[PDB]
């Protein structure tokens, strides 16, 4: 039957609408394989016909519009939207040519969203659908659809809808204005985010939105529309505000490049003439950050005495600061986007009581953005970074891998995503930029994302866990700033580094230990709570047999030397730094240890138990007897390694010689306790 | 392109535009009241 | 110190951007809060609420939403700061002119439910310290400065009709989480600076007790008794005893800090600064107790 | 194997040779009559080169026997069309396929 | 206690069979009682995450009763309430469960609630289950019936 009969056959209309909802559910969230399968059922010709079908019911028109968006545009739009929060600006001549205002203190404002943008954004990848190719793995790409034709069709349809709305027809398309406008505005917003539209297309959209303000008919902004349409208009204006912010950032980077070049040439000339007194030579014997702080510390006229910069250069900087304030609209019929948005939002709020909290939040967030522009730029500068043009291909590859990892945050973990994550990490570590530009990597925040992935998995994927741990260990070993950044999550790692370290590879405890190596500031900032937690874990480990070994049939003994050793070496790194003993932590750890004597194992237990030499001899006899050793871990060696680690830790906790000579009571007390714990004769017996 | 030639009976042969048996586009040989021929197949009862 | 002109261009540009942002952008002063509040407080051409009232109702809605923990929202923090900064901003005539202008500015807020929004947000935070609670406390101080009797009456009526205990449970938890001096931390810091914190939340403690003092300013006997005991509520919390408990902990810390420096003749800058902030907090606590007991 | 039923005669002299790129239009349907694929809806001729296992065996076996301009029906048995596994979500197991193929151009 | 009552009342295939042991006067309310029991169970389990998580151990108990001719709607509502709340059940749902639900569609007709259940089986709290999406696609689309 004709599909138009569903306007009266409501049971089938509802069933088919829920069928389309199921299609969107099955292909939701990056399931490109299902999207390809769905392309065999809902093809391009049907979708394009449905877009222009003016007699289709509203629910079906909306369903087909959402199905098209889900199938073809959702993944690309989401990845681009994730990449839009960063500003990596190469130092190219096109970037150099960027200016705040067009050439034609303050001039006329340019059109938003039109111009040259040099920020790096990875390209979209699509594959043609086909169901006759030999069946073969690499991730499938999204199906390809003609974007130039789709955008032209969307523009024409929106213009026709605008004209019909002006005519106020009694039979709106889809049965209501909402069903006539919302699908089209969603399609236009998606294409705008994907960046398909060109300069002429954006100009046409701006003309339809407001033909009078955006002039170098009647607009949407002055027609009474429902809340859903107002929400889509807010999304559009949010996009154009983001484009204005990006333009300001790029112009600021271009000016920074020119001013730094002038500063370097001037400093070179001043040093050249200065080579032919502490005041004259202090500048060149100071760190470059302090040099540029002194060079730029001339804003006020009450401190313009020590600055050696020429007045012409100071004037150039003041001129750029003035035209930056003017571009941000700080005073020294609407005619600009800021006034248009403010007027529209206020008019909307004072004309009726808005019932949609999402719309209310959107309009007040936009209003706050318009009123506070300088603060938004201030909070966006930390995510801006300039790179050399020779590292563009590696930066783009790194961004592609990071986009894949971020796309893996919204999917249940599986073997294929595990393999993709592993190869993405390997590719990241194979890049020289990852080591050349550590500040940029921290600004990108890969370690936070990896930690969040790890806690989401938490052992089902030991290769993944040890890959993440090795990545963070490498990250800490690149620089001290990375180590300090990872030190703030030391407690977060410890609370998840419980029983179940895995008998595979690097563990969260290993990353935590690697995050405090050779850092006195962090060793002294090590909280006591973390040490009590570790000693409590070791005490728990010292009273029960290892469950994995028991599940592997090993003979039962009432403690876990392997786990105790793993915690012991962590305390060894926590208490021994740079070849010297940190007495504050050594004293705290020793006092906790003596407060929990069961941590020392069956030996040294008291009230029955032989010494270290007897324990070692027993372990030797166990090693020589295979039946007591195995059902690969050898219990004799594990026991010896445990006691060796314990003795090493106690030895490294010893007070310093200069303290013993100073006669410190606490140092003497600690040494007396250690001597009481470890007799000398047992040491000689073991050495013999 | 659809093109069939044949005979039809006055009673019963009432093909309406649009939908119908199977997939729409009913012509000669799509029912038991008509007998068509398209050059390669003999059409009767919606069977080629 | 290799000269700046020998550095690569992109790195020097990044250092320039950080220096420029640190020295020129933040230092700029731009006052727009009064203009924004004035624009939002005007209607034009049952009275449906004006945009500011709808904003407050929206934040009260999300504060009353039943959820285990309130998520952080920069939009609320930004508007709370704007609202707080827009309310405060010698002969007898202009002293009175200043008081009347302050009253009008506070009326623009407390006539649109800001006091209830503050109480609801405080009860919603459930005693978890952070930027949300700090912004709420700052807004409450901003709207309570001068001990506005109308605001005190509105807060007391709202508390008595709701009969909720979350507000005082949150207050007690915050007072239990307020920090004092730490000699072990001070020694650790001294070693760290020798290689080549203490009372970080002092401002939060000060504003918490300033808010409690302003709740009883003006000899509000009804609010003093309500603080001592809540008759209608199922449970009663004595804020006065919690205040004395914190005062005792602070006093013991000050005594230990004096004995630590008693032997040495010279006291360093960090010790002087920590003494100064500890004395400032003790001063605020003493003023709060005085406001508690006056009336009498 | 593959059966060929001609629907429109071709040139009958120019056959696909090794290495040549064939550009065709096709419609692929199941034996029950349900259509599952058609390049004409996408308005784009499908291009492939001969002898490089780029398509299912039956398809290239049929196209190899077709001349320039010929229109023909290809029948493909399950043993060569995707075998027992089929195509997940599109083609069920053991499906005999029907292809309406027109050879538009070579190279 | 409600589950025990349901299990003991479910051992009879029909009202006449229950009449063979409890009489006709007791049998005329058997269907009403079982429907009320399922309605109460749904009210008892709607909106409680802990209670929905309790069904992560005995999901086959609910699924195997989907083919019963009586209280079909109530049992479907119970399953919908459990699935819309507990992500653990989605992690325990298997192929035989999905095939049973599709057979429910095949045998009881075009009901949109079964479609809503299948939609809910895919994504919960913004995270999608690839295994469920693939199994639904494999076992529902290619038939074209």
From Swiss-Prot, chain D:
Q: What's one GO MF term for it? A: signaling receptor binding
Q: Which reaction does it catalyse?
A: [protein]-peptidylproline (omega=180) = [protein]-peptidylproline (omega=0)
Top-level class of the enzyme under EC nomenclature = isomerase
Q: Which domain of life is it from?
A: Eukaryota
Database matches in InterPro entries: FKBP-type_PPIase (IPR050689), PPIase_dom_sf (IPR046357), PPIase_FKBP_dom (IPR001179)
Q: For this UniProt entry, what is the primary localization, expressed as one broad class?
A: cytoplasm
What EC designation does it have? 5.2.1.8
Q: Where in the cell is it found?
A: Cytoplasm; Sarcoplasmic reticulum
Entries under SUPFAM superfamilies matching the protein = FKBP-like (SSF54534)
GO terms, biological process = 'de novo' protein folding; calcium-mediated signaling; insulin secretion involved in cellular response to glucose stimulus; negative regulation of calcium-mediated signaling; negative regulation of heart rate; negative regulation of insulin secretion involved in cellular response to glucose stimulus; negative regulation of release of sequestered calcium ion into cytosol; neuronal action potential propagation
Q: How is its activity regulated?
A: Inhibited by both FK506 and rapamycin.
List the signal peptide residues: none
Q: In which tissues is it expressed?
A: Detected in heart muscle (at protein level). Isoform 1 and isoform 2 are ubiquitous with highest levels in brain and thymus.
Q: Where is the PPIase FKBP-type domain?
A: 19-107
Transmembrane region positions? none
Alphabetically ordered keywords of this record = Cytoplasm, Isomerase, Rotamase, Sarcoplasmic reticulum
The keyword Iron is assigned to this record: no
The Gene Ontology CC terms held by the record are: calcium channel complex; cytoplasm; membrane; sarcoplasmic reticulum membrane; Z disc
**Function, in words:** Has the potential to contribute to the immunosuppressive and toxic effects of FK506 and rapamycin. PPIases accelerate the folding of proteins. It catalyzes the cis-trans isomerization of proline imidic peptide bonds in oligopeptides.
Family statement: Belongs to the FKBP-type PPIase family. FKBP1 subfamily.
Q: Can you state the subunit structure given in the record?
A: Identified in a complex composed of RYR2, FKBP1B, PKA catalytic subunit, PRKAR2A, AKAP6, and the protein phosphatases PP2A and PP1. Interacts directly with RYR2.
Quote the protein name from its UniProt record.
Peptidyl-prolyl cis-trans isomerase FKBP1B
Which lineage is the organism of this entry classified under, starting from the top rank? Answer: Eukaryota, Metazoa, Chordata, Craniata, Vertebrata
What gene is it encoded by? FKBP1B
From Swiss-Prot, chain E:
The post-translation modification note in this UniProt entry reads:
The N-terminus is blocked. Channel activity is modulated by phosphorylation.
Q: In which tissues is it expressed?
A: Detected in skeletal muscle (at protein level). Fast- or slow-twitch skeletal muscle.
Superkingdom, according to UniProt? Eukaryota
| UniProt-annotated location(s) | Sarcoplasmic reticulum membrane
Q: What mutagenesis or variant effect is reported for residue 130 to C? A: Decreases threshold for channel activation by K(+), caffeine and 4-chloro-m-cresol. Decreases inhibition by Mg(2+)
Any remaining note in the record?
Binding of [3H]ryanodine indicates that the heterozygous channel is activated by Ca(2+) concentrations 4-fold lower than normal. Single-cell analysis of cotransfected cells shows a significantly increased resting cytoplasmic Ca(2+) level and a significantly reduced luminal Ca(2+) level.
Q: How does it assemble?
A: Homotetramer. Can also form heterotetramers with RYR2. Identified in a complex composed of RYR1, PDE4D, PKA, FKBP1A and protein phosphatase 1 (PP1). Repeated very high-level exercise decreases interaction with PDE4D and protein phosphatase 1 (PP1). Interacts with CALM; CALM with bound calcium inhibits the RYR1 channel activity. Interacts with S100A1. Interacts with FKBP1A; this stabilizes the closed conformation of the channel. Interacts with CACNA1S; interaction with CACNA1S is important for activation of the RYR1 channel. Interacts with CACNB1.
Which family is it part of? Belongs to the ryanodine receptor (TC 1.A.3.1) family. RYR1 subfamily.
Instruction: State what this protein does.
Output: Cytosolic calcium-activated calcium channel that mediates the release of Ca(2+) from the sarcoplasmic reticulum into the cytosol and thereby plays a key role in triggering muscle contraction following depolarization of T-tubules. Repeated very high-level exercise increases the open probability of the channel and leads to Ca(2+) leaking into the cytoplasm. Can also mediate the release of Ca(2+) from intracellular stores in neurons, and may thereby promote prolonged Ca(2+) signaling in the brain. Required for normal embryonic development of muscle fibers and skeletal muscle.
State the domain notes: The calcium release channel activity resides in the C-terminal region while the remaining part of the protein constitutes the 'foot' structure spanning the junctional gap between the sarcoplasmic reticulum (SR) and the T-tubule. Pore opening is mediated via the cytoplasmic calcium-binding domains that mediate a small rotation of the channel-forming transmembrane regions that then leads to channel opening.
Q: Report the protein name in the record.
A: Ryanodine receptor 1
Q: What stretch of the parent protein is included here?
A: 486 to 630 of 5037
């Amino acid at each position: 039957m004709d599909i138009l009969e569903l306007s009266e056959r409501l049971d089938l209309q509802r069933f088919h609408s829920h069928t389309l909802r199921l299609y969107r559910a099955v292909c939701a969230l990056g399931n490109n394989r299902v999207a390809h399968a769905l392309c065999s059922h809902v093809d391009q010709a049907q979708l394009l016909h449905a877009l222009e079908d003016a007699h289709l019911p509203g629910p079906l028109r909306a369903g087909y519009y959402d199905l098209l968006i889900s199938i073809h545009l959702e993944s690309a739009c989401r990845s681009r939207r994730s990449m839009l929060s960063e500003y990596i600006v190469p130092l190219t001549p096109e970037t150099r040519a960027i200016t705040l205002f067009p050439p034609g203190n303050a001039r006329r404002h340019g059109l938003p969203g039109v111009g040259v943008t040099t920020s790096l954004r990875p390209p979209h990848h699509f594959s043609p659908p086909c169901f006759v190719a030999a069946l073969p793995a690499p991730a499938r790409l999204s199906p390809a659809i003609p974007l130039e034709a789709l955008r032209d069709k969307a523009l024409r349809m929106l213009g026709e809808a605008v004209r019909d709305g002006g005519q106020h027809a009694r039979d709106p398309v889809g049965g209501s204005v909402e069903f006539q406008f919302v699908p089209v505005l969603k399609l236009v917003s998606t294409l705008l985010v994907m960046g398909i539209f060109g300069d002429e297309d954006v100009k046409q959209i701006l003309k339809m939105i407001e033909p009078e303000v955006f002039t170098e008919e009647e607009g949407l902004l002055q027609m009474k529309l429902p809340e859903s349409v107002k929400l889509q208009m807010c999304n559009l204006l949010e996009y154009f505000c983001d484009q204005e912010l990006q333009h300001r950032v790029e112009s600021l980077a271009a000016f920074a490049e020119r001013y730094v070049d002038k500063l370097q040439a001037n400093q070179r000339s001043r040093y050249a003439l200065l080579m032919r007194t502490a005041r004259r030579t202090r500048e060149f014997r100071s760190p470059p950050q302090e040099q540029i702080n002194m060079l730029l510390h001339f804003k006020d006229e009450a401190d313009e005495e020590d600055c050696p910069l020429p007045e012409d250069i100071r004037q150039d900087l003041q001129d750029f600061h003035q035209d930056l304030l003017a571009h941000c609209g700080i005073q020294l019929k609407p005619q600009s986007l800021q006034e248009l948005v403010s007027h529209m939002v206020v008019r909307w709020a004072q004309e009726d009581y808005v019932q949609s909290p999402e719309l209310v939040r959107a309009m007040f967030s936009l209003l706050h953005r318009q009123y506070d522009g300088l603060g938004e730029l201030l909070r966006a500068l930390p995510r801006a970074y300039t790179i050399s043009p020779s590292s563009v291909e590696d930066t783009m590859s790194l961004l592609e891998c990071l986009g894949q990892i971020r796309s893996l945050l919204i999917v249940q973990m599986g073997p294929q995503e595990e393999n993709l994550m592993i190869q993405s990490i390997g590719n990241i570590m194979n890049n020289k930029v990852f080591y050349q530009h550590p500040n940029l990597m921290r600004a990108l925040g890969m370690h936070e994302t990896v930690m969040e992935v790890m806690v989401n998995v938490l052992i089902r994927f030991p290769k993944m866990v040890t890959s993440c741990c090795r990545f963070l260990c490498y990250f800490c070993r690149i620089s001290r700033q990375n180590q300090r950044s990872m030190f703030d999550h030391l407690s977060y790692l410890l609370e998840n580094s419980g029983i179940g370290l895995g008998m595979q590879g690097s563990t969260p405890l290993d990353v935590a230990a690697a995050s405090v190596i050779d850092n006195n500031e962090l060793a002294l900032a090590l909280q006591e709570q973390d040490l009590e937690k570790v000693v409590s874990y070791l005490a728990g480990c010292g009273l029960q047999s290892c469950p994995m070994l028991l599940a592997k049939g090993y003979p039962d003994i009432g403690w876990n030397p392997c786990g105790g050793e793993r915690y012991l070496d962590f305390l060894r790194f926590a208490v021994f730094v740079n070849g010297e003993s940190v007495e504050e932590n050594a004293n705290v750890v020793v006092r906790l240890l003596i407060r929990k004597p069961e941590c020392f194992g069956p030996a040294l237990r008291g009230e029955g138990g032989s010494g270290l030499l007897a324990a070692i001899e027993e372990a030797i006899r166990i090693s020589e007897d295979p039946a007591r050793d195995g059902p690969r871990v050898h219990l004799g060696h594990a026991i010896m390694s445990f006691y060796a680690a314990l003795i090493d830790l106690l030895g490294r906790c010893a007070p310093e010689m200069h303290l013993i000579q100073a006669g410190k009571g606490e140092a003497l007390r600690i040494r007396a306790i250690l001597r009481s714990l470890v007799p000398l004769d047992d040491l000689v017996g073991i050495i013999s | 392109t659809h093109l069939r030639v044949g005979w039809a009976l006055t009673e019963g042969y009432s093909p309406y535009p649009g939908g119908g048996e199977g997939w729409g586009g009913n012509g000669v040989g799509d029912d038991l009241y008509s007998y068509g021929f398209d050059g390669l197949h003999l059409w009767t009862g919606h069977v080629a | 110190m290799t000269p700046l002109y020998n550095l690569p261009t992109h790195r020097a540009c990044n250092m320039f951007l950080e220096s420029y942002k640190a020295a020129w952008i933040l230092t700029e002063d731009h006052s727009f809060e009064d203009r924004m509040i004035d624009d939002l407080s005007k209607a034009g051409e049952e009275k449906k609420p004006d945009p500011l009232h709808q904003l407050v109702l929206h934040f009260s809605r999300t504060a009353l939403t039943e959820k285990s923990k309130l998520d952080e929202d920069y939009l609320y923090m930004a508007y709370a700061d704007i609202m707080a900064k827009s309310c405060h901003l010698v002969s007898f005539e202009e002293k009175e002119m200043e008081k009347q202008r302050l009253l009008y500015q506070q009326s623009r807020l407390h006539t649109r439910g800001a006091a209830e929004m503050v109480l609801q947000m405080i009860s919603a935070c459930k005693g978890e310290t952070g930027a949300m609670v700090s912004s709420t406390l700052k807004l409450g101080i901003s709207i309570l400065n001068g001990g506005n009797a109308e605001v005190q009456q509105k807060m007391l009526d709202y508390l008595k009709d709701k009969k909720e205990v979350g507000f005082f449970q949150s207050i007690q938890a915050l007072m239990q989480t307020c920090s004092v001096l730490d000699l072990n931390a001070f020694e650790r810091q001294n070693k760290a600076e020798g290689l080549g914190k203490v009372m970080a939340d002092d401002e939060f403690t000060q504003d918490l007790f300033r808010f409690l003092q302003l709740l009883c300013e003006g000899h509000n006997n009804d609010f003093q008794n309500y603080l001592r005991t809540q008759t209608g509520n199922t449970t009663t919390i004595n804020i006065i005893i919690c205040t004395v408990d914190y005062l005792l902990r602070l006093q013991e810390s000050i005594s230990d800090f004096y004995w630590y420096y008693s032997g040495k003749d010279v006291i360093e800058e960090q010790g002087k600064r920590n003494f100064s902030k500890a004395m400032s907090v003790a001063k605020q606590v003493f003023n709060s107790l005085t406001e508690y007991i006056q009336g009498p | 194997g593959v059966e060929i039923e001609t629907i429109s005669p071709g040139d009958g002299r120019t056959f696909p040779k090794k290495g040549q790129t064939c550009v065709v239009h096709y419609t692929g349907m199941l034996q029950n009559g349900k259509k599952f694929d058609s390049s004409r809806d996408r308005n784009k001729p499908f291009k492939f080169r001969i002898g490089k296992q780029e398509v299912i065996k039956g398809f290239e076996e049929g196209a190899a026997q077709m001349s320039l301009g010929q229109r023909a029906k290809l029948t493909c048995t399950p043993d060569v069309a995707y075998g027992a596994t089929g195509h997940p979500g599109v083609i069920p197991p053991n499906a005999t396929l029907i292809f309406d193929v027109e050879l538009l151009n070579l190279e | 206690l409600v589950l025990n009552c349901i299990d003991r009342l479910n051992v009879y295939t029909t009202a006449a069979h229950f009449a063979e042991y409890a009489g006709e006067e007791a049998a005329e309310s058997w269907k009403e009682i079982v429907n009320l029991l399922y309605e109460l169970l749904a009210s008892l389990i709607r909106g409680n995450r802990a209670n929905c998580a309790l069904f992560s151990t005995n999901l086959d108990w609910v699924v195997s009763k989907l083919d019963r001719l009586e209280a079909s709607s109530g049992i479907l509502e119970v399953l919908y309430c459990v699935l819309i709340e507990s992500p653990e059940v989605l992690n325990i749902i298997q192929e035989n469960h999905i095939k049973s639900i599709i057979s429910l569609l095949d045998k009881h007709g075009r009901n949109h609630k079964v479609l809503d259940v299948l939609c809910s089986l895919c994504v919960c709290n913004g995270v999608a289950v690839r295994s469920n999406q693939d199994l639904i696609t494999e076992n529902l689309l290619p038939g074209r019936e």
